[model samples]
Target chain A: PEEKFKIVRSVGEECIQEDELLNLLTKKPEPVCYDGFEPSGRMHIAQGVMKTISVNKLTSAGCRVKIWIADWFAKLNNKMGGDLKKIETVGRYLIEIWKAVGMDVEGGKVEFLWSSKEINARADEYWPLVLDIAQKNNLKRIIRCSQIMGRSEQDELTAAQIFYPCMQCADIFFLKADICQLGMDQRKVNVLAREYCDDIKRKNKPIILSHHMLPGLQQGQEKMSKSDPSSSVFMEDEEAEVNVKIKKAYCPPKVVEGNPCLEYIKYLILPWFNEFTVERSADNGGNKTFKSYEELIADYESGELHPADLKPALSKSLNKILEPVREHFRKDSNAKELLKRVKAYRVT
Target chain B: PEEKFKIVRSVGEECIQEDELLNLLTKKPEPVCYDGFEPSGRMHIAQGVMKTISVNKLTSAGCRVKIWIADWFAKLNNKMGGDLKKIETVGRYLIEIWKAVGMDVEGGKVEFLWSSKEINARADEYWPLVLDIAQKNNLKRIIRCSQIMGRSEQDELTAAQIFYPCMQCADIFFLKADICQLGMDQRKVNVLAREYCDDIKRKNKPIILSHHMLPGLQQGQEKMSKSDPSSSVFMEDEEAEVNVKIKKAYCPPKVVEGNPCLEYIKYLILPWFNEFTVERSADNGGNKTFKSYEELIADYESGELHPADLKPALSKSLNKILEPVREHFRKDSNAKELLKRVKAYRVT
Candidate 1:
């Protein structure tokens, strides 16, 4: 049980209503969890590397993970300029990335489902459930969760935008997910789902597992995004490009607060390598290795590490981690063809 | 064209965008028109009598009328305590009533369509249109149409209520409706459909023809409702019961403004009879007759017509109109069984 709890805690920042998760794990042999992603643009390391880590940990903890490819949501947001065919191609591209990343595909522990297909097949059940959720929640409560869709309360929203959150809440129940695994940005909708379950008198509420959102490569940015390539490291970026990006990334000398480089190392590097190593020159105190994140942060905070050394090491570590992904896309004919088309596709 | 125009003017108070209605009648041989109703309660004279008159006039004007039986809307509103089986039964009962009323169903000029069935069959097309309409409108605009759903902007509304107006707008386009024939209360939503069509850059907009709403038997009420039986007569009410209810109706002598009885006489009785006759004692001005609503309003405003002579005459006319409907329900085995079950079923 302790090992199971550790596994659950490995990826997310916190498990909402921790007791529900503990209770679920104690009673159910294998519970289901899901996270939804819109196929809007090329995959970023946060979605690729971080997601792989999360799903692996979830599966190891005896939970099945269902990744919802939000093709419908992308169309709602006018992603890919509302070209459903192109949007579907993007969805296919994402699944290919997940496959190459080894996202727990064995033993039915991980599966990918398309939102449009699921909804089209069961619209009768799905639409009523959407209306039911909407009927229970007021406009104010729904508007509060608009940020989940990259919208704000003060923004002039289309009718679909206002109803999007309610549909998201309904999605959780319809999927029969025992736990909701999502990034912190999606916390509002997950909370709304829990509230909806309570309002409808459901005996059990799905536990929420909100993971940390990695910051952009630029300082003070909250998230990595496709709108700015410099702000994020894309999965398709070449090794030299990754190195150049990390070299110019925001990393202050010995300042760990809100540093994107440090964030990437903490969330991605440490998880992948189980340690952090800084290869320093002889004049600078030769090669210091970190066996734990605590040890690394302690040394870095004390000014023992410089941004120059940390940047190169972090870049090298990321390149090594993404090697298999690059090879998979380069060798597989279908994946290679998909990548070529997606790269040429313009994002409006 | 002039004949069609005259037919169109026979029922509604006025046609919105009258120029457009004229052009459509002149150009198109058969234009489609529709009005939607939620099957929540027993058939009342306001719905039965007024709707029959409206559809007949539409078809006579070279228009094909589609009656939308909103069983899905009723379920969302928690009618019949959210029992879908009961909601569908109510929808069936409504169709039976319309059939008995000789609602221009011949030659495919008039047809009944179920909301649940329509959505289930064409969900792929229907839902996207719903989203498109929603995407174009903001929350404030949608809330302004809340009154159509019997809700106020100041009141707490469920999410479904927010999306209701948008779905209604989408329905106009999906059904290929050329005209929106509805009551004055639904003017806001019909106007919204026109605006949405304009926003989407559609070449044509559905013309709105709003009918006058018949008030309740209470003096100052705006519309008749099924919740208060004494407020208005039901289609199933016997001749004696109709007389008793109309006898107790509020009708002040020499007053016509906002008078429920006067409004009913103007909207229903005059439309049905083409003229109204009131029998009086020999000492008291003998028998008086009005050939038009304008003429009746003029006489009633001049204090020449008394409430004493008007109420009984109105009751007689209403009873005579509902006689066939009452007989239909009593004689048809299917309709009789439906009525029995509906009456026994508790409305929540």
Candidate 2:
């Protein structure tokens, strides 16, 4: 239905093809949506908030969301120094965040899966498909998809890094995914799956729904940093940490373009609370609450709204949104221990 | 102790390090030697006779030889159109030749294993080893080792072709091989295994015995062709085919160097029969026999031997060696059926 299609489109910044997505929602009552992220570090706000939000949106749209915890893939990419044991724990910590956050876990349409577990269970079926896809494409084409792992063609990539793209392309068919619901950074390999389908003469090509990646808190850092926790507000960050990051977050005065603060408000706060509020004293313009992003951007660009006013407002809203996640991790001893270990890894 | 070393030295054109080989022989009572080849076509003489001879030589030296039937590896190389079933049948036909062509099948030290079977059986043990080795090397280094598969770095290789080297590097460790007994062409990847051992701080690195590749029948072609049956003698070629191929074989008169005919006589005939005999008219040279390659080469380079006489002499020796293999294939219904299909594949 157009209803499901519209809601799905709202979650993704750009759907590869709107018409294909439309046909899918119209024809299939319960289509499978695939989403995955490497778990070598803590989940930043974009990965935590955007992914959970996307999973909720897709599931409400009659799509069954399969979250592939790519612990093995992370190991292959030398994440955590190729430690599957640590990567697995990091992956588990991510699930804990989603459960405590706004993810629709009780709704039961969103399922969690493991890459190493699934691939190992059906290795015979999995490897042949991977090998077949690997056989069909040239190394140059596969190398082009290396960007999926935050690696480049010029990088002295590991042989496993070259292998990463093939397995990523194979994951779509292996999981029987109808829609790819990953972030914009993963667009290349998702598109490769579609191209592979064309080469194999497969009629059902997976539709891609690459969601928006909320920019980092720093200027010119479009992609967030994993090493620097201060670059983006993390899911389980303390209230003061959220406040500090947002205060320094790149929010230019009277500029809507390349404004990360505006993006965070548009994608996160509005989606979570449905409105953005900034209480002002009688001297500064009375309390202005943005009902929609359209109304908010105009006032901000026209100088009615300023960075000084926006920073404190954005920080409060983000902390309010992240409070439940922080509380959940603090309450559960197992999750708290996992956090301690994750923090330890960051220190070293 | 030196007896076994000298025999194994005769089998290989070069050992990666003689000291390492000596250490392995001194330390391990019965070292496991690993060898493998892509089985997408009929077995050529070098692959068939040389492999069997090497297996025998190593086994005789108190080493257990394991021949890896790389049917899956062949499919990844796009061999036999990437048909695993066809590649498997071709692999089976290869074993048939070794069985009949004077391999020490009855000696009880040689073993035949399957890459797909062994890898699948211990997938947990296999893939992690592959991925771990893949993690240590870069694309340039791994691409350099692509020569192991008859692929060039400049070739527009498939993604599977890049993965092929990683899997091959893993095979040395996966098989627990103390010795890598393969052709000189496979030296790069075998060296990669030693490098990997060094990286992992593994004390027991695999010693490499890179056997000499018998040259093609045509001049200036050091490597034999897989498609052209006349390029080298097939394990089951008829007596007439052997004689015809030898007639056109690149045998430079009075020139032992770059002489394929002299090579066949030295490596094959002398190894098989322990001597070479060439009979002629009393005026030219009455019945003569060379007990060693040094004696044969001295006569050939001094104008005491001619291509016309040497050609017939080498052909007769090769046929004499191949007769039992041809007879076995002709008589056995299953092997005959396999040979018939092999010939059908050759025509295309």
Candidate 3:
């Protein structure tokens, strides 16, 4: 039970209630974990690589991860300038990236449900639930939910934006997710689902597995942007592009307060390879391999590992991890076409 | 063409784009006129007799009227104390009333579509349109839409209530309504639909047909209440109950304004009977039949027709109109059961 707990815990940066998670693991084997994406643009590493790692961990803990394709929400968010077909293509692009990046989707390890389809099939059930959630909450609490996704915090919110949080909260209950495996930014809406349980006298509240946020490549950038290509390493980016992004990334030597390059290494590469390797000449602390991120960070903060060495190692590891994803896009004609259309979708 | 236009135009107190209405009647043999009712409680005379009059006229002009059974909206409005089953029962009860109240639903003249059902079947299409409509409008515009139906001018609005105007606007497009036949109160949201057409560059916009609002039984009461029993005469109320309400109803003799009895006589009795006939003895001036509301109003203001004479006549005519509806409910087992359940539903 503890082993399963640890396995699932590895995926979340913070669990809302660790005791509830422990109890859930002990009683319900193969509990469902719900997470979703709005397919508005190109697939970034946070969604591609980080998602693969988290989904893999959840599945390893005997959880079934349900990935929601929120194409409708993308339309609501006015993504691709409200072009639904283009957003759907980006959704397909995301599926291909996850498939290549080692997310276990076969043998019922993970399942994909399109929000547009599932919610339509059960709209009688889905919409009433959403309306009830919206009814129980006021305009203020629901408006605060617009801050769930990192991109926008506008002065004026559209009626659709206010409706969004209610729909998101409904998604957790509708999918029957025992665990909500979403980012920290999505924490409030997931918690809103828990509040809904309280409102309705639902005893077994959903557990929230709030995952870590990977910042953009530059300093002062809180999170990666799907719109700005230079903000993060995309799944299908060229090896040179990965190198350039990593080298140009803000990593101030021993200071690792908001370093996105270190974020990638710690969250992505370390989890994938079980270690980080820094190859150097004999004079510059030659060929050191880190079995744990703690050891590497300790050495770096002590000035033993310099930025000159760290940048190349981070860049190389990221490229290696992203190699299969790039290759999949290159090899698969459908994937290539999706990437082609997504590249053309960015407008200012 | 002019005759058909006049026939349909008589039903609407105010027509937005009267020229478009004329164009529609001339071009289309069977234009679709859309209206809906939230099955919250008992059907008032405004929704019962008034709707039948309008729908019958539209059909007489070779137009098909689509009546939306807004059981979903009823639930959102927390009607029947949020019991969806109760709301649906009320919806069935309403259908019975309309059927009995001389509504020309037969021969394909009028069709009933359940919002819960139609919207579910076309959710992929319906929800996207709703979201788009919501996205185009801001919070202030939508918040004011809570005033579309007159019962509540709440200090704090629920998120579900705010989402309503968007759905109502989308209903026009979803059902492909050419003429929006609703009360004057719903004008803002129907006008919002025309505004949406402008945003999307859709040339042919929906036409708004704002009907006259029937005030409640008391003076200064703008609209009837579904929750309050004394506000107006219910379709299924006993004949004696109608008499009691009409006898106690507000009707200031020699005053034309702020009179619900006069409004009912103008909108309901006059339209149904084609004339207002007041019967009195030699002391109060013998039987006088008014073919026009304008003629009746002059007599009412001139003190030629007293409230004592008008109230009994109004009660008698209202009883005559409600007789068939009461008989239907008493005779039909299903309708009786529905009314029984609905009568037991009002908590406050």
Candidate 4:
């Protein structure tokens, strides 16, 4: 499965062809891909592609994989009116959702690690590393990293924001990761990892796998962002809410073009689905008959299928596609409890 | 013999005349001249002149004297090699020399203070006052105070240098000193004391007395400096060395006409000498035969004097003039120990 699912990346107009970018899935051993997330907010499905599909492929292909509940970095960067209590509660909720997703962790199961619990106790050990990274990187470099962190473009980022990037880079080295992985947005920061490892004369520079940026469900251009409420669809959303979002999505006519729902099918579903490719009539979109994803794409590109008829069939197929993931998440003990806690948190 | 002296200063080139400067010598309420020295290196004579002549005059005139050994500032300036062991030894050497020179600092008579032992402990407590002065005096005003700190045109003094003025100003505020005293070269730093005390809304703005800058023994062009081998007659130099340096001094007829050495005699010796006014013949630069200093100066100013005859008289008068100070230093036990230790240290 991982052999077929090699990651690709595109930044705006720049598309990284498969041949140009290194194929890491079948390559020599990579250092464990230690991708950490702070469970400081509700775990939205927008980030699920990273936790599930991306990390799963890397792990199943024999890469040592790790996931951390980056509670401390969250507390520091988000600061959120300086309330630590609220941050901790959100972090616990994040853990429950990951456990519910059954993230395909290999080498080591996606372990729940906390910086406050592990790193703080050994802060004396890590502080020197922090200072080393700090000395190596200047304020300008740190601020650029902050820009990609997606915080506002304020003239000066907060001191905590400046410090967070080095800590993240140091995390990879601390784990002795052979290769590091993150969404494409994070590629720039991990590039520093290769620089740091090379400078230290380590036998291997950590390889970075920058996964393709996934578009939000509503907005076709931008990545799914938590601040863009409509663009982001949480794993915990009710079935009715999921259906309504799909019905109103920007699925265009003629070729299922310019619509995220259709793009999701072409990008996520077509490649991942097996056994069937759901299709409908062509008089409306298809050839007035059901067909496989390949049959439909061929017909649609040849101008024989319309996008409006393709919408209902794709929506049904996508909902059917998300059924198992959704069922597993709801039934999981940790997931249910996590949802309850986060819902309570949001209400309060 | 040392009783008649006064506290006075020149506000500008025209603030005090030759007559007024002379009158200031016998004015009552004579304040002891105090100068702060960061003990960054050996106790050179450049720092000792004000303490030796002017402060000695104040002591004889019944004024309380203070000599601060700025070990804290020495460390702050990174000038001291940071050996606490050496600081104690240096302090002991200074105490012995000051006392043996008839400095009258016995029983706290004229206070001999150590800044390291006293001030650094209170730095945090005094930091607010220091900051207040720094904030009140903008950078331009502070730059003007750098003259005595030995900063040159090329060297861009740092903010650390600016902060130093505040520390020095805070010292006067801490002491509640009535009159701040310094050598004329230190006029800028002393002015801060006046400004700081006044700006803080204190009733007294502390009168400042900046005495004349001492000329080097060899030349009238430069200030006396221990670093320039030929420029000073160190009290620690042996009698042979002193005589050798004096013999090589620039005292040609035209050169010594308004020679600073002659000026030193007029300012330092004539007013303080108790026994006699030694006259010089007109053809060889002798002023007059007189019992009074005024009459001697009158003849010298009226061109009824020559310098060739003046040299021997000054050399004799000055040697006698420094006899007590040089003998005091020569008899110091700590000085002997330092000499021994330094010799051994270099070899090891």
Candidate 5:
């Protein structure tokens, strides 16, 4: 039992009580896993890298991975200026990136579904579930989860924004998902979904894996967001561009905590490469290779590993991970045109 | 100039804004009037009498009257325990009562629509309107209008219950209603509809005419409800039952204010008969028939007309008005069976 629990928690940073995950694994043959993303802006390496790792791990653990392309949610939040057509275009662009990154889309291990399409097909069932979820929750409870939508509790929300959480919660049940694999920012809504499932009889509670969110390149920032392009390195960025951005990224000396460059190594580099190598000159403690994240963090914390040496290694690892994605867009005419169109489209 | 305005205000106790009603009359060729009722419980004389009078007058004033059979609303409120079939039965029964009581359905002046059917057909258009209304109003504003659903702000409500007000507001726009001729209980939601229309740029605000509410047969009760059998007389009640109910009804001698018996005479008897006849022996005032409501109310308030004399006259007037409805269910085999089935069904 402890072994299964550990295995479930191994891939993600946080689990809202991992016992549920262990129980689901023990009981179900193939537990369903879900993570919804607003298909807005260009795909960033920070967003794609960890997501691919999580989905791969989920499939390996005998869970069906479903990537929810939250086009409706994006429209509800006024992303892409609430234009459905543009949102759908961005959604297609997102799927192309996932394909290029080798997400387990083959053999039906991983799949993508749009929220708008599913809702349009089952509005009667979906809407009633949404209404029911709203009924069980009070205004205070719903507003508390406003942060999940990138909104503050004190912010004056649109009715659609208030409806966002209920719809998001219903998405888990409607999709029949057993495990929620979302970022740390999405933890509140996932937790709310679990609570909602408990309140309604005949509905099963889902296990939540709140994965570690990649912090912004700036110090003290908690997330790398689409709102700030400088905070994230896009998957389609040239190798030189990735190097320059990583070189300027916030990585304080002797400060491993909240270091964006160190976080990139821990979440993306080590997971992708199986080892992080710092190719340094003989002057500064020769070329060192970290076999585990513990080794990398310990040296960075003790000032044995300098930010000067770590930045280039991170850039190299990220560029390696993004190379396939960059090539896919370059070779695929349709995907290439889509990327150009999305880049030209202004965000609301 | 004042004739059309007077004609519009002739039947109802209050209008949200008389100026708006006047403006609508001046501008439109034929303004639309609507009244919605949840199809639960047996049809009552108190419910039908005033509604018929109001609709007849609205038709006279070149307004198209629409009676919204709130079957979906009843289902949402868990009426008949959320059984749509049973709710539909009640809706049909209510329509039969209106037809029997001489509603303007004969000349195409009055129409009926079911919320369930309308919503199913135009759910995409309707739900967005509901969302738009919810977006325009805050939680506080909506909770303030909770009384429209016969719910208090402090009551624990299902999301469906919270959604009830928003849906009701959308019904007005979807129905293309120009004037909301609702009972006093529906004033809050009608007001919300106007406020919502103002907030949405393309939508037009509707004129609201909140008709006078008939007080319960018992003293201290604000309105006659189908839930309380003692508080109302059913349209299908036997002649003897009407007499017993009226004799026991709260009729304070020399008090016309908030008197349930006198209210019946003003809103129902005078409108139906054009006069109130109090038949008595030679010793008491001989059979005196008042030609207007003012004449009857003035005598009752002056202590010239006793409760003893008024009660019997009201009973006779009510029986005469309900005769056709009683015969309708008695003769029509289908309607008769529907009444039997609905009566056997328990209210939830």
Candidate 6:
């Protein structure tokens, strides 16, 4: 069958296209998905939008998931620039965000743990392992890991950064998981994890499903950035806010004939063509008519549909579809309880 | 009296052979002296020989003397490279050697205080005053102080060695002694101690008595050193070995001068001008002609008394004098006990 675009499901940069992803889901599913982040600043919309999808997708696909709340890396990098209160809040915020977004990950099931607590309490057992892995890497590899791990680029990364790749890789090798998943932005970091395991002669070669970069409402030119308020649709947003944000999006007008919300369709959505088709009238268009979603895309691609008309419909459809999500977040009891705990959790 | 060599005495470094040492005797001289060493290493001959004289002279002077055993510095320096056991032994060994030399200073008052125990319990109280004085001297001056205090060559001095001077200087100042007594080598260290008090705007500089360096048995060259066995006569030597070694010493033809045992006549015998000089033999060349000990020296200085004939006479007198020292070493109960403790003590 002909396809509009390839669906890329990237797990730690080992990308699987639509067919491969479908086969893996239909034939065999893994038990766990491993993903990690250093909780420095509070979880922003950039993190919430994409990571929420990964957790939800893995949950729906029947895979267990472990999300590491990397407080140790947070302190080591001096992130939050010496404010312990902020670091502490980030951990709790992450948990709340997962629950708010309806991701199946939870405190115990996801196995949230920190490096400092482990290093301090059981150093006699773990330090030798960390040190051994450190010798396998040079300063270059360490610096690259630091950059990939999102440590600030201003200073030369410390020796702690050199040991981080080992710890992260150990998270997978230690669990002996079947598959490792990561956002496309974390592709390099996950690649290094694989390299680290291989260099150190670990036997497990875990499968990777590196996710595609989520198309933020604002732009695809940049990584999902916290500093850009318009770049993502936050789960924290209420129904009205989600609607308003969607209505103001920059979706191309030529993409409006079939499914306005599906214009930026990539990984998860393109395979739904066989399930449904869309049709539109003059009230929604200026001159061009899409016979089928494919016909409309052809007409749009050949520059028949105008960008101005396409954007509003895309925004409106998105607002309608996501209204339930916004409501779910607004009234979520577990999320609220989680948020309260997160706000109270200590960081230093 | 234009004395041929200056003879001075003080309990501290500053008041050398002046009012302080003499006044202590005049004002009811208690039978005690105090010399301390940190157990950085085995006791050197310079300290061993001079300390013996310090204790012996006071005893001979008719004062019921007490000699304080100072093992504090050894602890401060982390003696025997931080082996507490070795440090403890060094303290005991020092006491053993002191008693073995027939030093008449009261041994019971020779206290060996464990410095670690003292510092842990009392340093906080005393350290403020010590640091206050240390702060007054900068790096260069402290290095110079170490050189004179402990023979640290400037280039080879470590930070710890440099700081050690303040401790030594403070020991004297805090003790508030009437005088400081030391060998000639201690002149620079003691001078700095006086200078420190003056510069710090403190009151009182104690008198300092710096005695002569003990001449080697072969006085034609430098002083006898422990490293040079033939040049020295150990206080522990048996009477037979003592006689044989003294007879082999190079006393020039007709000049009894540089002979090992004979040189004691010039240093110890002539200094006291004792009637014990009667021990000089009638058959000895200088003895046949010279009327007295003073006459022998005058004739020697005048080149009339030959060293060859004087050598046998001086050795006979010295043997009688040192007989008690050898016997005391063989019999001292405290010394024997200390040696056993040193052997048993563990070191790294």
Report iRMS values in order. Answer: 1.8, 1.3, 1.4, 11.5, 3.3, 15.5
Tens-digit lDDT track for model 4 on B194-311? 6665666766555566555556666445576645657666545556665666666655453435466555665656545643455655555545445565665565566555455555
Give each prediction's DockQ, rounded to 2 decimals: 0.56, 0.69, 0.70, 0.03, 0.31, 0.02
Candidate 4 per-residue lDDT, tens place, A1-348, comes to: 344334322211232233322444345444366666655465555455444655655555556666656765665445333344666677766655555445653234556666656564554455335445554555456556764455535643343555467777778777666555666766767777667666667755666666556667665455646655467666666667776776666654544445566556655555445333435554444335433556756766766555555556655655665565568656777656656766665421
Question: What digit string (tens of lDDT, one per residue) describes model 1 on residues A116-234?
Answer: 88888889999888888877777778878887977767677667677678777888988888877788878999889888888898988988888888887776788887788888898
DockQ versus reference, model 5? 0.31
Residue A119 deviation, candidate 4, in Å?
A: 1.4
Best by lDDT: 3
Q: Candidate 3 lDDT, tens digit per residue, A1-348?
A: 999998888888888879988998899988888898988677778888778988888787788888999987877777778777887788888888888989887757798888877887888788878888877887777776777754355666688688778888999889988888788788889878888899998977999888788987765878886567778788888889989888788888888789777787898889999999988778878899999989988998998898888889888888889899889988988878888887887653
State how far residue A32 of model 5 sits from its true place (Å): 3.2
Per-candidate Cα lDDT values, in order, are 0.82, 0.82, 0.83, 0.56, 0.79, 0.51
Residues A1-348 of candidate 6: C-alpha lDDT, one tens digit per residue: 111112224223356334544554455544656676767444554355455555655565456676666665554455554444566566666765565555554434565555444444544445334433444444355556665555445654343444345556555555555566766655665676667667768554555676555555664543445435555564445556656776676565444423324433322223212222223455644343233456646656766454555544444444444454546545877556554554454323
Each prediction's TM-score versus the true structure: 0.92, 0.96, 0.96, 0.48, 0.86, 0.42
Query: Which parts of model 4 are misplaced by more than 4 Å?
Result: A1-30, A79-81, A105-108, A152-156, A254-258, A279-296, A302-309, A317-337, A346-348, B1-348
lDDT of 2 by residue, B59-150 (tens): 77788888899877888877768788888888888888889887787978888898888877787768877778877888888777877778
Candidate 1 deviant stretches above 4 angstroms = A106-108, A332-337, A340-348, B78-83, B105-109, B223-227, B285-291, B298-304, B333-337, B340-348
Give stretches of model 2 more than 4 Å off.
Answer: none
Per-residue CA lDDT of model 5 for A177-284, tens digit only, reads: 877878777788888887877787554678777788888987678887778778888888889999998988998888766878777888887887789878998988
Window of ten residues with lowest summed lDDT in model 3 chain B: B148-157
Model 6 lDDT tens row, B1-348? 112012334222335435434555565444233344565443444455555665555445543332333344443344444445666666667666665555553644334444444433444334334444544454455555553434445344332343345555655554444345565555666777777778776655555665555567565644555446666665445567556666776655435444444445544555333432433344533235333457665656666555554555555655665665556545777666655565454442
- The CAPRI class of candidate 6 is incorrect
- Docking category of candidate 4: incorrect
Candidate 2 total steric clashes: 0
How many pairs of residues collide in each model? 2, 0, 0, 16, 2, 37
10 residues in a row with least lDDT, candidate 6 chain B: B1-10
Error of 6 at B96 (Å): 27
